[PDB]
Amino acid sequence: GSHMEEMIRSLQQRPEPTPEEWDLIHIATEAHRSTNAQGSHWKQRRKFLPDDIGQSPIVSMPDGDKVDLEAFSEFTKIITPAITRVVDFAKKLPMFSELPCEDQIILLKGCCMEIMSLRAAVRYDPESDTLTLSGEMAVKREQLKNGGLGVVSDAIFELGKSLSAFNLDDTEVALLQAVLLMSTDRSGLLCVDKIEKSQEAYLLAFEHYVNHRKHNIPHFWPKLLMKVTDLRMIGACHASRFLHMKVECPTELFPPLFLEVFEDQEV
Numbered sequence: 027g028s029h030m031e032e033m034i035r036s037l038q039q040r041p042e043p044t045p046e047e048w049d050l051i052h053i054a055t056e057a058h059r060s061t062n063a064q065g066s067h068w069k070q071r072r073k074f075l076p077d078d079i080g081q082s083p084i085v086s087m088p089d090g091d092k093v094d095l096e097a098f099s100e101f102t103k104i105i106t107p108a109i110t111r112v113v114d115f116a117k118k119l120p121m122f123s124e125l126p127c128e129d130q131i132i133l134l135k136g137c138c139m140e141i142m143s144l145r146a147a148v149r150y151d152p153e154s155d156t157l158t159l160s161g162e163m164a165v166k167r168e169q170l171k172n173g174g175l176g177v178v179s180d181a182i183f184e185l186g187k188s189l190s191a192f193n194l195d196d197t198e199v200a201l202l203q204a205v206l207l208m209s210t211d212r213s214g215l216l217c218v219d220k221i222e223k224s225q226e227a228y229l230l231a232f233e234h235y236v237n238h239r240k241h242n243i244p245h246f247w248p249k250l251l252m253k254v255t256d257l258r259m260i261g262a263c264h265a266s267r268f269l270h271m272k273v274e275c276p277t278e279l280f281p282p283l284f285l286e287v288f289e290d291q292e293v
């Protein structure tokens with residue numbers, strides 16, 4: 027390019043975001059920051075789930091990993107604001123909010139657990155070996171496992187542990203969420219092509235943002251893509267388990283928003 031342009035790009039090889047992509051990045055980043063219930067201190071801040079909760083799984087589940095009702099109830103108590111914030115996030119992306127209402131609902135149902143799991147995982151704390159839920163509750167593996175998630179707990183913890191070394195910033199988290207959200211791997215969508223074009227736009231912007239960041243761990247982009255796949259697997263395991271739960275447990279134990287968002291892979 028021009029002489030100044032060349033000087034500035036001297037140590038970039040790879041494609042940077044275009045100005046249009048920078049706008050997309052800026053909007054998504056701010057959408058995430060404003061909805062992630064995370065200030066400046068998120069660690070020193072809030073609270074561990076008491077040690078004596080989550081050690082007593084006694085409700086049966088088909089896979090043999092029983093549920094501790096007390097821990098389950100502690101989790102459902104905080105889950106409604108977590109779900110709500112995912113919706114708040116999505117509503118702030120123009121490519122999402124311009125979709126038919128019915129498509130918006132399908133996309134939210136499709137990715138809600140994926141995004142919640144990512145948000146918990148990025149708050150993994152190696153020192154205490156905890157995840158943080160709804161931005162306030164720190165939990166141990168056993169507590170989250172016994173409190174209803176079973177093997178899904180192990181999967182989120184393993185993701186959180188592995189993500190520590192990626193040093194993701196708010197933008198990278200936000201773009202991961204946008205890619206999870208704008209997926210056509212759901213049934214009943216009207217605007218399939220538009221949603222796919224949006225996902226393609228986010229993916230390319232995200233790849234370019236990763237180039238911009240110059241991470242010092244190698245193969246960063248495909249490594250991050252593999253984590254997207256892990257999150258989708260977490261979402262699928264959760265969907266299967268949630269069906270089970272509803273078979274096992276009375277409806278009064280499930281907040282209405284919790285029931286609504288995790289509808290339909292059988293119930």
Ligand SMILES: Cc1cc(OCC(=O)O)cc(C)c1Cc1ccc(O)c(C(C)C)c1
Pocket residue numbers: 098101102104105107108109111139142143145146158159160161173174175182264268
């Ligand atoms: C309750 C909780 C909230 C959390 O929020 C993440 C975010 O808002 O930052 C993210 C995680 C993964 C869950 C744990 C959870 C997620 C799904 C689910 O069905 C259950 C039942 C056992 C009540 C628990």
